[PDB]
Design a protein around this ligand. Sequence first.
Ligand SMILES: Cc1ccnc2c1NC(=O)c1cccnc1N2C1CC1
Ligand SMILES: O=C(O)Cc1cc(=O)oc2c(O)c(O)ccc12
Ligand SMILES: [Mn+2]
Ligand SMILES: [Mn+2]
Lengths: 413, 552
Amino acid sequence: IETVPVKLKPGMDGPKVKQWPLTEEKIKALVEICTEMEKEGKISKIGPENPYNTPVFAIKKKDSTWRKLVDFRELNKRTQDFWEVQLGIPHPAGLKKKKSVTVLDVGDAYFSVPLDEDFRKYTAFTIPSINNETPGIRYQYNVLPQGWKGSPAIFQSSMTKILEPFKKQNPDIVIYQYMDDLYVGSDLEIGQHRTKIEELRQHLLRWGLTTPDWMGYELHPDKWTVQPIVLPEKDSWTVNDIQKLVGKLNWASQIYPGIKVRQLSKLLRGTKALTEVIPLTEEAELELAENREILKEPVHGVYYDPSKDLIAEIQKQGQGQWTYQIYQEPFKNLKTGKYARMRGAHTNDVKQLTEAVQKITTESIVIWGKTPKFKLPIQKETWETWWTEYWQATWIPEWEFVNTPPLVKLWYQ
Amino acid sequence: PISPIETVPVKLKPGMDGPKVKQWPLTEEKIKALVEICTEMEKEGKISKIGPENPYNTPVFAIKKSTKWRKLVDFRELNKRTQDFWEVQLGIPHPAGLKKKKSVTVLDVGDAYFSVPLDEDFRKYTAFTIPSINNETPGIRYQYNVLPQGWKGSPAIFQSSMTKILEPFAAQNPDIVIYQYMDDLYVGSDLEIGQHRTKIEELRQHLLRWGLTTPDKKHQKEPPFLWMGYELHPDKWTVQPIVLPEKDSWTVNDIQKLVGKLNWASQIYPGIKVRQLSKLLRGTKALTEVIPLTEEAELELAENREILKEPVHGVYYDPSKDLIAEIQKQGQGQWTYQIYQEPFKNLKTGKYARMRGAHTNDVKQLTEAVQKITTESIVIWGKTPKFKLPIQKETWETWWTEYWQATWIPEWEFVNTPPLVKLWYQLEKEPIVGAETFYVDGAANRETKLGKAGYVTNKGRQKVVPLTNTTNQKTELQAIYLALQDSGLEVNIVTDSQYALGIIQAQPDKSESELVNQIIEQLIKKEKVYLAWVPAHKGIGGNEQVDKLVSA
Ligand SMILES: Cc1ccnc2c1NC(=O)c1cccnc1N2C1CC1
Ligand SMILES: O=C(O)Cc1cc(=O)oc2c(O)c(O)ccc12
Ligand SMILES: [Mn+2]
Ligand SMILES: [Mn+2]
């Protein structure tokens, strides 16, 4: 009943972000959602003296019939030192090492805490109308809104208190909170681990805190690694195959110092046809084997800089496959990976890319407690019109749109 | 008279005080006109005399056209100190998204702003002074009690006040559609004309009880309603008349205005083109500079005059029927589309002509056009249209499977109307056995721009071409062009240029570079081409041989 005073960062005004146009079915769903939220006092209508706005979308975690997702990305940047410095939620480095990690949505708890009365005007949002036929429906939040990085910072003391009996009861379980999500990691058998999650759900339910109802929200970060680069093993090398191989190793030497290609180049002397078969000499085979032993070792000197942003690049590999790498400085990868899923009838590109972004973002949160900024291989307008069709997360990472193709496609196959 | 309308609380920007601009003297006949106008505004409660403790002021002028003077207050300094408001009427509806109505009435809210009160605590900042004659006596001090004309917050507050006044009427009459724009009201309904005119009168009376006056049925406007450059009938719409001038000479201003009018007309008039006319605006921003119309620009303008020769109208939206969009290629990277529910009547038309960069292909541009239409449809009708496209399924399926970017394609139908969208050539995925292997390379001097482009083949053929006014990039493209000129219908080409590899693997069929076009012409004539890449200066077989030739 007593509100925590909240302030923007010094010298910054509130967000004024355009509301994206929405289909008719999503406007209706948003109108039904907000009519209830206003009856429940969570949000109230505002007037023209509130110039701020934050975009809203309608997404769909599988259920009977629609949830409201607010893109607080701008408001989060403009309230940053309030939530990252004053009430920052530290990051445990052991969460990435547990055998199983389950993710639980606790965002419903925020709705019981009132929001600082002088801060509510910054949570203003608009439900658009079809073809601008009527002015937007303008609301602002009265309670802590989901997706705002200040809601967990305020609810943190209440969350530590609710979780305290569970942690003393289970001293080995790692619990980390990122926004509206709890990440719970254990080293238990998957059957015992799911029982412990149900126990924790019953603990939160007993203290009045509702939650959901081999994959899904269940992870296994002990099986994740940084992925290795691999060279093909062939019995017959053509001139073209060797040229592919010297090209890849020349690109690899940009990351690994000790790569050598001299013995392989000397096999291609004197203007050969591309399809000519070249048997590998003993000296090139040993050159090839020594390079294979260099790529099985991690690149050394790669460290995470908490002062820098994380960058995530994605490559479309075809055959429903996608490769990604997370870095802060070019060619010093902190993690690389691959994504693939195979249901021809239901599946398409934007679909795969959207699920890849959410997967990479979840891996990022588990490991560094921070989302990356994505270099998305897609047209800007195409992504902006369809990403909400398959978004099932409560957060939204930063993204930008890459317009040049890379030849490094096959270099990551 | 206290107004029954709830005032909106207004604040000044933080750390700013109200305006303190002193009033310049005006002529005696202006002052006499100001005293007469203000005394009538004071009687109507729109202003009020204030004491001397108010330290603020804003200049006032007076000017006439009728036989009446008008009062003008220059609120520029107060606007700079006024808070920001929720942006007003930024997006207007597109008439193609409205639904047909039997009757539509326009209502001009006369004296709109002065009928809405102003926040009491904020009125002190609107103080102004009528100067006494020869500045010998104290000036007459007034301040506003309503929304002043030209103040930063008057449009936002009035529209907000108007909506709150309208919402009980609309709640009682869900069979009535109202759209507000500035101080106008467009009221449409499907009721029989008798009871529709009754609802209009009920609305006028409802508005009148809050101090909002509206034109009598006598002075109520009639079709059509000139609004935002459109002409609106209850059952059809079009753009206002487009007049393209005949001129002996054309400046940048004249052609910028011309492209604007042609763009505006393209939303209903099908086939408008603006590629050649917009090419003339490249790079130059001198408004009065005369640009000579090219041969292609003259033809394009001629083609548009023929399209604009007789009127075209658009039909309104029927939500009960499917939305269909069809696209045709015009050539030179130009496309046009129509959105319709029924034949012979279009909801709207439009064009997509942009090249994203220097090179594209038809399948990519078609996808970008479908994207532009999908965005436009969601804004106007809240949904995605069914597409009819001049591309066969096998053509698109092989493109979006192998295109390096992610993309989404809606449900669509193939329309056989030529010209069809096709893949003009496809590079081989594996090297061609029995086909000659060309090791191409190029080089140029960055100062003299003198270059060389040549090749060495496995068969022993070698060639070198001298090049002037070129770059290392162009030479690498000239080298591939050379190997395509001198090879059979099947050829393996090995380059060291990542640049040239990225261009050709993008499989373009259109380009702004003449050289790339010539390479496209050669790739079409070939039967099988394999393009391979190796690192430069790594001892890689034939590449080191051709590198030594053109380096010299
Ligand atoms: C300018 C404008 C903007 C938005 N809607 C409308 C209009 N004006 C019309 O005349 C109109 C014509 C046909 C259908 N709706 C119309 N109306 C609506 C109110 C019935
Ligand atoms: O690879 C480089 O270092 C730049 C480079 C690019 C290229 O397309 O062609 C090159 C070339 O023909 C050279 O002789 C040297 C360097 C390059
Ligand atoms: Mn080269
Ligand atoms: Mn070279």
